Amino acid sequence: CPRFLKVKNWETEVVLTDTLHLKSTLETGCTEYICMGSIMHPDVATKDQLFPLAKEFIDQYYSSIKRFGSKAHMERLEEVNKEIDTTSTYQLKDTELIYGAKHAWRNASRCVGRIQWSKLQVFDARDCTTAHGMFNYICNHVKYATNKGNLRSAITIFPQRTDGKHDFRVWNSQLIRYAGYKQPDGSTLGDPANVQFTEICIQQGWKPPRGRFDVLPLLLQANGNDPELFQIPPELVLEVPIRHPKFEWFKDLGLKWYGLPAVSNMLLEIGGLEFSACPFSGWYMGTEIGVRDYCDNSRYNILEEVAKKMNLDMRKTSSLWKDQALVEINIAVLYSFQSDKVTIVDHHSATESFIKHMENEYRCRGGCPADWVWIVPPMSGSITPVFHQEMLNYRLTPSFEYQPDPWNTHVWK
Amino acid sequence: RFLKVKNWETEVVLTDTLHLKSTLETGCTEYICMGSIMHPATKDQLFPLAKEFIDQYYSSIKRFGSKAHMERLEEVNKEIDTTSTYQLKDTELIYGAKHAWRNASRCVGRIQWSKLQVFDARDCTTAHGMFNYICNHVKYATNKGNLRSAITIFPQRTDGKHDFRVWNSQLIRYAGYKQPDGSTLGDPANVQFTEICIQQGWKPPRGRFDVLPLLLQANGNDPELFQIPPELVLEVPIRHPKFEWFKDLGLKWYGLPAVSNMLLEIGGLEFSACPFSGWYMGTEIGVRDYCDNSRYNILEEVAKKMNLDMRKTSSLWKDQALVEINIAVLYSFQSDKVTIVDHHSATESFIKHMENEYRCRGGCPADWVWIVPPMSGSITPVFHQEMLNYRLTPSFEYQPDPWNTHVW
Numbered sequence: 001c002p003r004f005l006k007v008k009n010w011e012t013e014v015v016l017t018d019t020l021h022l023k024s025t026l027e028t029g030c031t032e033y034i035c036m037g038s039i040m041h042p043d044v045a046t047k048d049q050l051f052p053l054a055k056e057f058i059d060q061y062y063s064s065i066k067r068f069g070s071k072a073h074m075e076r077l078e079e080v081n082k083e084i085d086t087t088s089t090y091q092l093k094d095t096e097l098i099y100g101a102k103h104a105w106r107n108a109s110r111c112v113g114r115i116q117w118s119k120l121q122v123f124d125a126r127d128c129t130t131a132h133g134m135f136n137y138i139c140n141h142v143k144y145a146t147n148k149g150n151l152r153s154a155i156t157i158f159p160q161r162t163d164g165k166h167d168f169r170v171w172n173s174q175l176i177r178y179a180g181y182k183q184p185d186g187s188t189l190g191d192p193a194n195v196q197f198t199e200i201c202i203q204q205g206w207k208p209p210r211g212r213f214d215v216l217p218l219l220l221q222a223n224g225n226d227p228e229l230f231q232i233p234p235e236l237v238l239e240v241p242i243r244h245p246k247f248e249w250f251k252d253l254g255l256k257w258y259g260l261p262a263v264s265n266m267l268l269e270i271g272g273l274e275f276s277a278c279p280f281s282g283w284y285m286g287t288e289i290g291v292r293d294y295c296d297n298s299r300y301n302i303l304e305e306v307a308k309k310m311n312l313d314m315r316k317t318s319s320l321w322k323d324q325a326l327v328e329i330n331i332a333v334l335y336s337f338q339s340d341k342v343t344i345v346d347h348h349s350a351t352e353s354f355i356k357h358m359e360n361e362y363r364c365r366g367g368c369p370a371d372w373v374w375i376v377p378p379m380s381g382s383i384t385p386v387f388h389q390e391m392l393n394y395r396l397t398p399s400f401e402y403q404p405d406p407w408n409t410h411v412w413k
Numbered sequence: 414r415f416l417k418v419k420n421w422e423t424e425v426v427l428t429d430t431l432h433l434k435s436t437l438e439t440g441c442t443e444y445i446c447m448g449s450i451m452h453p454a455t456k457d458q459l460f461p462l463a464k465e466f467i468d469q470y471y472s473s474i475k476r477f478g479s480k481a482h483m484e485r486l487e488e489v490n491k492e493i494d495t496t497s498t499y500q501l502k503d504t505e506l507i508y509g510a511k512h513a514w515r516n517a518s519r520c521v522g523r524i525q526w527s528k529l530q531v532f533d534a535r536d537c538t539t540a541h542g543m544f545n546y547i548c549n550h551v552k553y554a555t556n557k558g559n560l561r562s563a564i565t566i567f568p569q570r571t572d573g574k575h576d577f578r579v580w581n582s583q584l585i586r587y588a589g590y591k592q593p594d595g596s597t598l599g600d601p602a603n604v605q606f607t608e609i610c611i612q613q614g615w616k617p618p619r620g621r622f623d624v625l626p627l628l629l630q631a632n633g634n635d636p637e638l639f640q641i642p643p644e645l646v647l648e649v650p651i652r653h654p655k656f657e658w659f660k661d662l663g664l665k666w667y668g669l670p671a672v673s674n675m676l677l678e679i680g681g682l683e684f685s686a687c688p689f690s691g692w693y694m695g696t697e698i699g700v701r702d703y704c705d706n707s708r709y710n711i712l713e714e715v716a717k718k719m720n721l722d723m724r725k726t727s728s729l730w731k732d733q734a735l736v737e738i739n740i741a742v743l744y745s746f747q748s749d750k751v752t753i754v755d756h757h758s759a760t761e762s763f764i765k766h767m768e769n770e771y772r773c774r775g776g777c778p779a780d781w782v783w784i785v786p787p788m789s790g791s792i793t794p795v796f797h798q799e800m801l802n803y804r805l806t807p808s809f810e811y812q813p814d815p816w817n818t819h820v821w
């Protein structure tokens with residue numbers, strides 16, 4: 001591979017040079033004859049596999065704190081080697097854990113919000129042993145991150161995988177999500193995305209309210225045990241009823257959303273260590289709710305209802321009635337959040353900040369992996385600066401990875 | 414081996430086998446993806462390519478290994494030997510051009526691929542000749558508003574010293590004027606070219622929408638200027654169906670999009686001048702041409718007339734103004750009975766096309782970065798459609814701008 005790759009911004013003619021891609025560790029799915037860049041997703045490590053992974057990470061940590069080659073560096077290497085040799089694994093120091101989490105985010109090519117990467121509050125929950133303890137940790141996470149509306153990004157890290165039969169998992173894909181109920185008539189109530197997980201909860205004992213916006217309970221698995229249900233205390237769940245600054249009928253749609261986006265189903269990998277439960281949270285970009293959650297056909301699918309109330313010609317698709325309702329819905333989302341003083345960012349601000357971030361990263365780090373397909377917002381793409389920006393995609397480590405859904409792999413006791 | 418592509422809305426999974434046929438590279442590796450990078454002969458090189466293309470041509474007309482097939486192979490063989498090149502039959506030329514369209518991963522209009530009028534211009538020898546052929550193209554393709562896809566094919570490359578080139582990037586584009594006060598009148602994308610036309614003897618009307626002259630190079634010679642007779646140039650005044658003030662912006666666009674700077678490659682042969690044209694998807698004009706910062710850049714102006722609050726970005730004033738502009742474009746072309754497709758209809762057709770190609774062909778190379786429209790992405794079906802990108806031949810390729818390679 002060539003040492004220097006150029007990326008061009010086609011609207012500023014700015015040219016950046018990437019040297020960081022040379023540190024790439026995982027494969028992208030592409031080959032020389034086929035690009036998989038629009039593909040969504042293209043029993044443990046052994047002593048021999050673990051030795052180089054850990055060293056690679058440790059070196060990186062010590063290079064970051066400008067102590068590379070030092071006494072403390074070599075001592076740490078030796079202490080890790082000893083641990084892998086005697087216990088076929090090792091434990092990260094708190095400094096390394098915090099460093100590693102922050103870098104997993106920094107390395108997240110799909111995330112447009114990475115300018116904030118270094119302000120992440122890390123909660124070390126590696127002493128957790130039970131599902132009740134997980135629940136205490138997650139409740140504290142929510143309260144801290146939510147901060148009465150002034151959201152702060154945070155991550156809670158539960159114990160790493162050992163032999164694979166003792167995994168800690170959050171079965172929820174996000175800590176806060178709304179239920180979906182499938183009706184005998186084929187219709188769906190609530191959020192169609194969450195129907196399957198909702199059914200699991202019900203079988204596990206959950207009594208569902210059966211509404212449009214019912215917050216799902218946590219389904220928590222500690223130490224490879226069967227998962228357990230817990231209701232998040234309602235006062236810890238901050239919510240925003242959606243209204244429109246101009247259209248007084250918009251609040252009559254009975255729409256709301258939750259303030260805290262909190263992905264909880266990903267795997268955090270640091271130095272070959274696998275953290276299968278690591279819920280993290282930031283704050284919403286408006287389009288995530290306004291475009292995807294609300295206007296996707298397989299989600300809340302409300303464009304039509306919003307369109308009727310706006311009195312638009314919905315016969316000729318060339319009237320762009322869909323596009324017009326889409327904009328209003330997104331205006332309303334940003335207005336409701338800002339009015340309740342709940343942190344949110346519009347797609348114009350976020351994308352501008354990312355270009356700044358990316359330029360800084362190329363400058364100080366020699367690159368910034370980015371997944372254009374994910375970085376470009378799902379509305380008004382070309383009128384944001386990321387659309388014209390060439391991006392190189394590559395997988396650095398530490399990182400957040402996908403992992404199979406736990407109900408597909410769990411061995412029920 | 415086999416590759417599945419999922420649509421994350423319908424849950425339809427298609428299986429790609431066609432990609433095994435590619436030999437050309439895309440630029441990615443196992444460890445770096447360049448999916449959003451815009452731009453990543455000899456008798457010895459020439460035969461196996463000719464052979465491959467002849468093979469797939471006769472394989473497409475269900476006469477593989479036929480007598481006609483063997484004879485053509487020998488014929489091409491003998492000719493590459495004696496001459497360092499060879500000439501396509503008429504049928505092969507047409508097949509080759511339709512298939513370069515069919516294989517264009519960035520084109521959302523490929524449902525139409527097999528309906529393509531091919532104009533053989535391989536007997537051309539002068540720029541005057543080129544101008545005549547081009548004029549006929551425009552007239553045929555324009556067809557009084559009922560547009561028809563067409564391609565005009567000029568003599569293939571020989572030695573690189575005698576290329577035919579259409580210097581214009583499209584047959585019809587507006588001029589760009591670099592003003593004293595540093596701003597730009599017209600179209601900023603064409604500013605450079607516009608000034609190479611002035612330099613050559615063009616007399617600029619210095620307006621916002623001045624149709625550029627044709628600049629044509631035949632057989633390696635210097636380019637020559639030609640005005641396209643104005644009655645061949647169909648144009649559409651842009652107005653809005655509710656906003657009677659929109660007309661007063663004084664906006665117009667031409668009806669015929671006719672890319673003229675690409676290279677057509679068939680069977681190892683290079684057609685450096687092959688202007689092709691279809692019709693517009695509305696966003697091309699309404700989003701990119703008008704609203705790009707580095708183009709006409711009219712959002713600000715439109716946002717005024719709509720009396721929108723433009724202090725904070727989070728009022729989505731840009732988003733509102735954008736939608737109205739695109740409504741206006743669609744409305745105008747339709748009311749003028751001029752062919753145009755909206756991005757909702759175009760994307761629907763593409764998914765349908767994708768389904769056909771998997772069924773009968775084993776796949777459809779497609780570039781999600783280009784296929785997804787530059788506005789309202791996720792409310793179109795293609796956003797949710799996983800696509801595999803790969804390079805099949807025949808194809809349209811990029812080539813350098815002529816003014817960076819031509820001695821006079």
Ligand code: HEM
Pocket residue numbers: 101104105108110111112113114116120153154155280281282283284285288345350374400
């Ligand atoms: C602080 C405010 C943040 C904003 C505004 C933001 C924005 C976004 C957006 C819009 C996406 C696309 C999500 C989607 O389309 O579903 C995304 C993805 C992602 N973000 Fe961020 N993010 C933030 C914080 C974080 C944090 C704190 C982390 C990790 C510590 C993170 C890691 C990721 C990862 C791994 C993805 C990819 C998700 C996937 O592949 O499914 N982000 N982010």
Ligand code: HEM
Pocket residue numbers: 510514517519520521522523525529562563564689690691692693694697754759783809
């Ligand atoms: C018939 C109606 C057609 C429609 C609606 C259509 C639509 C489009 C659009 C919207 C693009 C994206 C261009 C951009 O945004 O800059 C595109 C690209 C492209 N089209 Fe089509 N097109 C049509 C016909 C054709 C024809 C007739 C050909 C060739 C014979 C063709 C070959 C291509 C190629 C090669 C590209 C990629 C250009 C590049 O990489 O710069 N298309 N098309």
Ligand SMILES: CN(C)c1ccc(CNCc2ccc3ccc(N)nc3c2)cc1
Pocket residue numbers: 040113261263281282283284285288421
């Ligand atoms: C359709 N599908 C298969 C699918 C759906 C969802 C996902 C998960 N990404 C959702 C996410 C991640 C990180 C985020 C960070 C900040 C934020 N404000 N929001 C975030 C949202 C992956 C795949």
Ligand SMILES: CN(C)c1ccc(CNCc2ccc3ccc(N)nc3c2)cc1
Pocket residue numbers: 451522582670672690691692693694697
């Ligand atoms: C600045 N730059 C590097 C650049 C500039 C122009 C291009 C050309 N592609 C635009 C195109 C192609 C084919 C089209 C076919 C039909 C249609 N209705 N529209 C079409 C539009 C590529 C690259």
Ligand SMILES: C[C@H](O)[C@H](O)[C@H]1CNc2nc(N)[nH]c(=O)c2N1
Pocket residue numbers: 010387388389390391448449450451782783784
């Ligand atoms: C950087 C990026 O590749 C570039 O801006 C692309 C994105 N997608 C596009 N899609 C289309 N149809 N046309 C374009 O010019 C572009 N530009």
Ligand SMILES: C[C@H](O)[C@H](O)[C@H]1CNc2nc(N)[nH]c(=O)c2N1
Pocket residue numbers: 038039040373374375421796797798799800
């Ligand atoms: C097919 C395609 O990869 C899929 O729909 C992607 C496109 N880009 C995306 N971008 C973001 N930010 N989030 C998504 O879920 C998706 N979905």
Ligand SMILES: [Zn+2]
Pocket residue numbers: 030034035036037441445446447448
């Ligand atoms: Zn790729």
